[PDB]
Amino acid sequence: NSSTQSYKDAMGPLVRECMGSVSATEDDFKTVLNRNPLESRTAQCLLACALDKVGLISPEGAIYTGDDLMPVMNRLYGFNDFKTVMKAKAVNDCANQVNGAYPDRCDLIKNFTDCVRNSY
Ligand SMILES: O=S(=O)(O)c1cccc2cccc(Nc3ccccc3)c12
């Protein structure tokens, strides 16, 4: 497990809906809910679908940055935890780092999530 209950509360319903449009396993559901490394391509695609639903992805398939991140951070985590809120900097930087670089949508999300995980 690598996620808070807040993350699961926000993402769970979306990931569930995504199971209907992505050919992912029940283990993949757990991987994604737990914010674990997305080893399987199915898990990468499952999160990609849910992050689109949560408002993190632009119409053009880019990960949002700056102000456009804030509604997502609020939905996932609220604003009461200093460490989590400050992590928005790493999320913004990682989004800038990966955007444009991965034509495959699931690859974009694998690399995004890895970058965020590697960030202190
Ligand atoms: O979760 S954190 O890295 O704490 C995070 C912290 C603060 C704001 C965030 C905004 C969007 C996505 C995140 N993360 C995320 C990470 C992996 C998969 C899906 C979303 C944000």
Side-chain angles (χ1 to χ4, degrees):
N1 208 134
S2 298
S3 72
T4 61
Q5 189 57 224
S6 41
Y7 180 87
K8 297 190 181 67
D9 288 342
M11 292 289 285
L14 309 180
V15 179
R16 287 179 189 283
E17 157 171 44
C18 288
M19 291 287 286
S21 64
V22 180
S23 80
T25 69
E26 156 157 15
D27 283 342
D28 291 331
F29 181 89
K30 191 159 211 56
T31 296
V32 170
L33 240 74
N34 285 1
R35 232 174 115 273
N36 288 341
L38 304 169
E39 190 170 335
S40 71
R41 179 159 161 79
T42 46
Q44 298 167 21
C45 294
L46 179 62
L47 183 60
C49 171
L51 287 174
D52 201 342
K53 285 183 187 280
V54 86
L56 188 56
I57 310 299
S58 82
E60 296 71 33
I63 301 167
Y64 280 132
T65 59
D67 287 348
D68 292 319
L69 244 22
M70 302 303 287
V72 177
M73 174 171 88
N74 189 230
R75 161 113 83 135
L76 293 180
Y77 298 119
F79 52 75
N80 298 346
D81 190 271
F82 181 78
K83 245 306 236 136
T84 293
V85 174
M86 296 302 94
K87 258 288 189 159
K89 191 196 178 308
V91 168
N92 178 265
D93 293 352
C94 284
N96 280 327
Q97 158 171 351
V98 304
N99 271 154
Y102 299 95
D104 184 273
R105 296 162 60 252
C106 308
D107 293 344
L108 180 66
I109 299 315
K110 176 56 161 52
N111 287 280
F112 170 71
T113 55
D114 283 351
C115 175
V116 173
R117 196 182 307 104
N118 297 165
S119 297
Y120 182 61

